[PDB]
Design a protein around this ligand. Structure first.
Ligand code: FE
Ligand code: FE
Ligand code: FE
Ligand code: FE
Lengths: 162, 162, 141, 141, 162, 162
């Protein structure tokens, strides 16, 4: 039976995807920490996200062990950008990223379903950050970002500062 | 005497008008809940209004029973819009709506007066939301709405967020 | 066009949530009618007035959760007329319970067809939402 | 021949109570099957095991009250086979809730046809018994 | 409308029927108080019944007043027997009597129903003593009554003495 | 190995036998609840028995699950009688029934023994009701049952009423 082989390879792919995502948020957080960007709450938002995604990876690592599989780590690739350009662009990038992480998470779930396997730690993690990142994107665009730096300043103070 | 017949038909029309209004505010509230609109306090404002107007309907239903009339329900028609376009337009629409609900409420009152009938639950509900909706409309227009999305963002944070 | 947050949300699922919203609003209307019938002095059954007013507010609260879900998933809410509740009398407290039976009967059945649809389309998010929403409607406290 | 206590108890009412007794026994059987399914180590849903065992004992207790009524009115109990519950698996906890839905659906509908029958035959004793028995099944605590 | 006239005549017939029944149980009770019958618990059973049936009459008298009708009393006829012959025969007679009282009680109920009138004090009093009197009859016959005086002695001690 | 297949079929047969027995006692209990039989303690005796036999079935259902077998239910057949004729005959029928249930229970035990399998929930349930039902049968016959209805009346009061 190919299943426990597929099942642990999928979990292993997902572990690397979550560590990758944690790495992207870390990169974004400290971009807003730069003196020429200097948006403190944009930096806190992404840093907190960075820690949540590392927690997702550890949860899947605990899960791989509980199912008797073998954790197989890979390189954590660098993000696609060093310069994230703007708070709008970073939120757009976080939205794209979460969608892709979620898509590979549906496939993990469609593997344990579609092979009759309850015990799907997935049922807690799915789809909640996506709408929030989309709302952030929407509000920044309506305010005039990224051309308007006043928009991102005030979004940092009013939405992400609460 | 035609009166108790007119009196309960009027109360019955008003019940449906209040349920209709509650339905409009519900529609507006969840329009601002959309990810491509994403104004949380606009959505809370209209939702709270939606519940107040349902309370008005129930008060008139209790009143119809206390006067020995018969409650006669009708279809609650859908609002005129699915897309309310902007926070300004929705406030303008709420203002138009409250004026029309109030006008049919004066006629209910000019029926119990003008036919010598105290016991007018109306004397508590009349004219208070209208000036507030007008002030909201005025402030949004002065700020630059609806072309300026910065205006509605800040109005949401500063006026409706208090 | 398409919502920027939409992902794995079938157009049939979106349309079925929109149908379920109107059903729950309708259920709220029907329970409200019953509640103010038992409030009549003809009838004066306060226990049944009290209980159908509570069910009216619960059904309307369930509709709003379905509306919240539609937006969270990037679907678009399309509201329709809430049809009048069909009978203004309800006669006895047991003839009302019978009407409430066929109504809760069709609302819960609609939720189970929603669950089958979410399953056929491999939408675990939708399925899990419908499941708990259904167990909630059915197993209070 | 005829019971010395029988009075105003139509032969159709007697036969319908005998049908309802078997239905409630059957409902008790079906709930018991479900309960020990969720007790399997495959499944291990103790909340659903606990709840369907309680419904099994309630349905069997309701059958005995119908049997008590049949004797109080001078009818004669005639028992039939309790048919096996149809499916031994039940798959998921929600596919069981769906089966429980159609079952409670048909049991309650049978009680309402019993009430209509008691009304057509001017049996206020029977009608009032079915009414409270029905509100009890439906409004616990 | 003939109804309030029929409704109070029915209540008036029922009042006299309950007083009649109370009179029959009184007669039976003190028959078992005779030295040549001498069954103390048969006498307590019927006496208690005698008081319950007087309470039924008073309940219907209170009801007639609450409905704005007029109480119209009649002669309370003597029972059909002075000598009730045996404990079996008296129980058989009580069974026949309760059935007849119940039958005129269904007609009272089929008058307020069948003329759409809730407020039927009847819904508390109907059919409960009948099965008990039938069980008593059954047990006495199976024991050997009325030829066997041992049967009625022991029934008095064991069933009616508890 | 045929064993776990035989072992769960036997448990499955026994489950249906206990539910069957519970059904027989239920039928007997409410026969003595009839107004023309009217023996209250005969009805309590069999009803209590009816509940004990349902508990036996559930114990074997719990056991089937603990052993990793599959519960396979069948029709619960109706008892052989609607009219149980007399308290003597019902006790005789209960005695015959318990003997047959016990015989299929020895075979269940001679299957786990005779195939070296401790873990025999049987060791708690075997042979205790049989002697009691036989004593009841003996006493009723000596008293004059079933021709004598005095006998069953007094047995109900003195033996089953304690
Ligand atoms: Fe993640
Ligand atoms: Fe209003
Ligand atoms: Fe009476
Ligand atoms: Fe047993």
């Amino acid at each position: 039976q190919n299943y426990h082989q597929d099942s642990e390879a999928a979990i292993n792919r997902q572990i690397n995807l979550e560590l990758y995502a944690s790495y992207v948020y870390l990169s974004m957080s400290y971009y807003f920490d730069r003196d020429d960007v200097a948006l403190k709450n944009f930096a806190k938002y992404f840093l907190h996200q960075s820690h949540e995604e590392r927690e997702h990876a550890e949860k899947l690592m605990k899960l791989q062990n509980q199912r008797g599989g073998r954790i197989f780590l890979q390189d954590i690739k660098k993000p696609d950008a060093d310069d994230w350009e703007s708070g709008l662009n970073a939120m757009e990038a976080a939205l794209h990223l979460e969608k892709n992480v979620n898509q590979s998470l549906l496939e993990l779930h469609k593997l344990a379903t579609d092979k009759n396997d309850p015990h799907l730690a997935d049922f807690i993690e799915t789809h909640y950050l996506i709408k929030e990142l989309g709302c952030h994107v929407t509000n920044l665009r309506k305010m005039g970002a990224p051309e308007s730096g006043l928009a991102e300043y005030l979004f940092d103070k009013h939405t992400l500062g609460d």
